[PDB]
Every structure is written in structure tokens, then in C-alpha cells.
């Protein structure tokens, strides 16, 4: 049950490389939480400030980090919200 | 002439994998940039034109942290140590501080500060009483980070409430 | 007209307004500050960090 | 007749259009900028990575 | 009409009151003092820590 569950995430929800409205549709509130989260980060990269940060200095780690506390505060308060 | 794309990749079109990231380092190269790096971290930041091979890498990173680490007393710790906020500073208009590190951080705003002892009460008080070593200077570089994000958070919520 | 809102509308060049209000408000001589401008050209990298770290320490020397 | 079409089938010669650009379209003399080719151009390589970088900072800190 | 008052109340321009007293009170002409200014004040900052040390030297040593 874990390797299915894990598998299936990883292909579905958050290899591809695009995220849309009908990819959320699929799944459940976790399920649909985690993929605006995975189309925020995407439109955060695409901010102009963070595509700039990129194009001068590339350094995804820097940029990892703040999408990583990012991604942990919020699911935090999803989590406590749906609770 | 429209021609919807419907064909966008992150990975393709806004973070493209260069040549230092997603390069794990075999053990020699470990080694060299364990020897010959000051900082490491200044490893991950390529900008302009990508070096052909680690020593180039190495060397470019070294003259990177001696240039911010020689940049840090005029930098912008230096500047911001005299009032964030009663000098109204906006740090959205702001390029990125790749090497700033909170170090020349030491907020002394003048104005807000009244009657000064320079003579601590007790030995107690006195500085930080964190035991542990660096202490004073991640405290400072958290600091400056929690400084900068809070006046500009400040700076959001007015551009925000101006809008609505 | 009005020089601070002018100022303040291009604060990039707040050298070009100065450079007027030396040659019309004070009485100093276009040629001076030309040939001035045209000597100080070698801007040397290192020379423009000592006058960061320079006017940094003037400005919280002010007082 | 048309600058960025010129500019874009020749980049070699990005000087060359730069130079012509100053020299009707701005003020500047032609002599001035004949003697400035002469006599400036000296340092080479060594600081030609420093400019490099040095370009690629004025870009991270145009705003 | 009263020179220690209005050095008192603008301290910041005792250079300038300075100048003034200089010129007028001790007989130096007011040329030298301009062109002194306009020429070798250059070294700025790293030796103004050796200068400020220089200054409390020289208060150390005055007798």
C-alpha cells in the first residue's frame, strides 16, 4: 500500500514539469492542497524577481530553501485548517 | 495570430539545469573543494558565463567570498545597522544580497536610543548567553533576515491596503 | 518650475540636476566642472569600494 | 535609414555602430574619439576577466 | 560681531568659520586657502582611522 501510494504521487502529482486546474481536479483536499502548493512554487519561479535571481546568479539552493519553509509553514496551517 | 503553446516546462523554460548544479562530485573533486574553498557555499552561485572546469569554479569562488567579505563593513549590514525602520527602508527594491551575511549587522539605531549605560548591570546580562560558538553572528544574520523580511512585509501590506 | 518634484520624479539623475543648479544657482564655470568630469574618468573598481566604505563612514560620522 | 536591423545582422561591429551612433547622432567629435582608441585600449586578458565579472555585477545590480 | 556663539550653535561648519577667521582676522590670502582645498585632501577613510588615532596622539601628547 506505502510503495503504491508513494509511487503514484510521485508520477502523478508531482513529477510532471506542468501544473493545471484539471490536474487538480483529480484529486482529494490533500490532494488538491499540495498541488496548488506545487503551482505556487511554480508561479513563484516564474516571479519576476526570482527569475532574475536565477538568470544572474542560478543558485537553486537558495531558492530551494525559500520554497522549502515555505512549503512547511503552509502545509502546517492546511493541516491544522483541515483538522 | 495567437498560437496557444500549451507546451510550457519549468525545468525547460524558468530553472535550467546548469552545469554545477546536478553535478555530483566525484571524490577528488570532493576533496579539491574541500581544500581550496573558503566558503563553500559561494560554490553554488554561476554567474555569467559557466567556468569550463572546477578550478575555474574554485578560484572564482574564493575571489567572490574575499571580495564580500572585504564588501561586509561598508555592505549592506554596515547600512541597515542604523535604522530598518525609523529610516523607512524598503527592501523590496532591492537587489538579491547573494553574499550579504548578517556580520556587520548590529542594529544601533540612533534615536531610540535614550539614557546608555555602557557598563552592564550585572555579569549576567552583559552580551547573549547562548554557550554555544558563532553565537552573535547567526543571531545577527537571523536578525537581519527577520529585519528585512519584516519591513517588507510591512511595505506589502501598505502596497496592498493602498490597492484595495 | 520646480526642482524637488522634478528631483524626485528621476532620481537618476540627481548628478545632471546638480551639475545645473552648480552652473546656474552658484556661479561656477561649466568649463571647470567639465574638464573635471573629464578627468575624473578612471573609475578603477577598487577606487569606487573606498568611496562606498568612505561615504558610509562619513554618513555615520555626520551627526 | 534603420539602426536595429543593421545592428543585429552585424553584431561583430557593435563598436563600429556605437562609435558612428556618437558620432552624428550624439555630439561627440570624431577626433576625441579617435585619440580615446588610441591611447586607452592598453590593459588586456588578465583584467579582461575582471571586466567580465564586472559587467556581469552591473547587470545583478542594475535595478 | 561675536564669533563663539555662532561657532557654538553651527558646529558643523567649523571648518568653515575656520576658513573665514583665516582669511580675514590672520592675513593669509583667500587663493591659497581655495586652491589647498581643491588640491591634495584626496587620501580619504583608511587613513582617517590612523588620522582619528593621530588626533587623540597628539591630545595624549600635548602637555
Wanted: no cysteine; proline share 3%.
Amino acid at each position: 500500500l506505502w510503495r503504491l501510494a508513494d509511487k503514484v504521487a510521485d508520477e502523478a502529482m508531482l513529477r510532471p514539469h506542468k501544473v493545471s486546474l484539471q490536474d487538480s481536479h483529480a484529486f482529494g483536499a490533500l490532494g488538491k492542497m499540495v498541488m496548488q502548493f506545487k503551482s505556487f512554487t511554480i508561479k513563484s519561479l516564474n516571479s519576476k524577481f526570482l527569475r532574475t535571481f536565477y538568470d544572474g546568479y542560478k543558485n537553486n539552493r537558495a531558492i530551494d530553501a525559500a520554497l522549502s519553509i515555505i512549503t512547511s509553514m503552509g502545509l502546517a496551517g492546511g493541516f491544522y485548517a483541515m483538522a | 495570430a495567437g498560437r496557444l503553446d500549451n507546451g510550457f516546462d519549468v525545468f525547460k523554460d524558468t530553472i535550467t539545469p546548469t552545469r554545477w548544479n546536478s553535478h555530483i562530485w566525484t571524490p577528488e573533486e570532493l576533496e579539491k573543494i574541500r581544500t581550496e574553498v573558503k566558503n563553500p557555499a559561494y560554490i553554488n552561485v554561476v554567474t555569467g558565463g559557466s567556468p569550463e572546469n572546477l578550478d575555474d569554479l574554485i578560484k572564482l569562488a574564493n575571489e567572490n567570498f574575499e571580495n564580500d567579505s572585504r564588501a561586509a563593513e561598508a555592505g549592506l549590514g554596515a547600512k541597515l545597522s542604523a535604522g530598518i525602520i525609523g529610516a523607512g527602508v524598503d527592501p523590496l527594491s532591492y537587489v538579491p544580497m547573494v553574499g550579504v551575511t548578517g556580520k556587520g549587522f548590529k542594529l544601533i539605531n540612533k534615536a531610540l536610543v535614550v539614557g546608555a549605560e555602557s557598563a552592564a548591570l550585572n555579569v549576567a546580562s552583559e552580551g547573549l548567553r547562548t554557550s554555544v560558538a558563532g553565537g552573535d553572528a547567526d543571531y545577527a544574520g537571523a536578525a537581519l533576515g527577520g529585519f528585512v523580511f519584516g519591513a517588507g512585509m510591512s511595505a506589502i501590506s501598505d502596497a496592498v491596503a493602498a490597492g484595495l | 518650475a520646480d526642482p524637488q518634484l522634478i528631483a524626485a520624479l528621476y532620481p537618476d539623475q540627481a548628478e545632471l540636476f546638480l551639475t545645473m543648479d552648480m552652473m546656474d544657482k552658484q556661479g561656477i564655470d561649466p568649463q571647470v566642472i567639465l574638464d573635471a568630469d573629464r578627468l575624473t574618468v578612471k573609475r578603477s573598481k577598487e577606487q569606487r569600494f573606498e568611496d562606498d566604505k568612505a561615504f558610509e563612514s562619513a554618513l555615520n560620522a555626520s551627526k
